[PDB]
């Protein structure tokens, strides 16, 4: 079948992991360095967080396989349960390719530079995941929305 959806969620787990490590939600001492595609990522060694992310990507993966994927959003909520930061991931499917590994790294650099500018989050913040899809009358890249605070 179409295995491209199997690799996107594969590094989507990395992307959210990076955000959690980078948006300093809490002491990140749980993270450990592990290598995939000869690039290392700080992945949380907390089993419950990994289980939540794995169940998340396992439920979203077939939506990628059926071209039912419009946006993937990561929302940061303050202790008042109000959103402060939204990482929107818009995806447009084509309207071996393992040899192109440099773009797997360049995606990471785009998240890094997009974070390089935002302000520091309030303490005690948590997060949640959103998936937006659609199949009505239609008549990858990302951008971030930051709150005033």
């Amino acid at each position: 079948g179409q295995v491209v959806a199997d690799v996107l969620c594969e590094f989507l787990e990395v992307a959210v992991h990076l955000i959690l490590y980078v948006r300093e939600v809490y002491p990140v001492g749980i993270f450990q360095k592990r290598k995939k595609y000869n690039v290392p990522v700080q992945m949380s060694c907390h089993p419950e967080l990994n289980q939540y992310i794995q169940d998340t990507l396992h439920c979203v993966k077939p939506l990628l396989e059926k071209n039912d994927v419009e946006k993937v959003v990561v929302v940061i909520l303050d202790k008042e349960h109000r959103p402060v930061e939204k990482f929107v991931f818009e995806i447009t499917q084509p309207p071996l390719l393992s040899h192109v590994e440099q773009l797997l790294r360049a995606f990471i650099l785009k998240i890094s530079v997009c974070d390089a500018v935002l302000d520091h989050n309030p303490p005690g913040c948590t997060f949640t995941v959103l998936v937006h899809t659609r199949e009505a009358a239609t008549r990858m890249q990302l951008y971030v929305e930051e709150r005033a605070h």
Binding site: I30, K86, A116, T128, L130, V131, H132, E146, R147, A148
Partner: protein
């Protein structure tokens, strides 16, 4: 049309809404009214463009320690 709110994550170790309640999670009172906040928009302050403060000026030479660090 479809929004899949994958509700989860712990703390300190008209379009259709497909919420993902999760198991015995039932304790932080009215979960749907909480999730109503996360789907809502907010006034976003547009991203600040990143620019350096002091570019590389060829006239102002910097300082350097005379010693080079020890090697392996």
């Amino acid at each position: 049309s479809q929004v899949h709110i994958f509700w989860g994550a712990p703390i300190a170790p008209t379009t259709e809404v497909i919420l993902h309640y999760r198991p015995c999670e039932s304790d932080p009172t009215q979960l749907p009214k909480i999730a109503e906040k996360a789907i809502q928009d907010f006034p976003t302050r547009p991203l600040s463009r990143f620019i350096p403060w002091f570019p590389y000026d060829g006239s102002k030479l910097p300082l350097r320690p005379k010693r080079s660090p020890p090697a392996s």
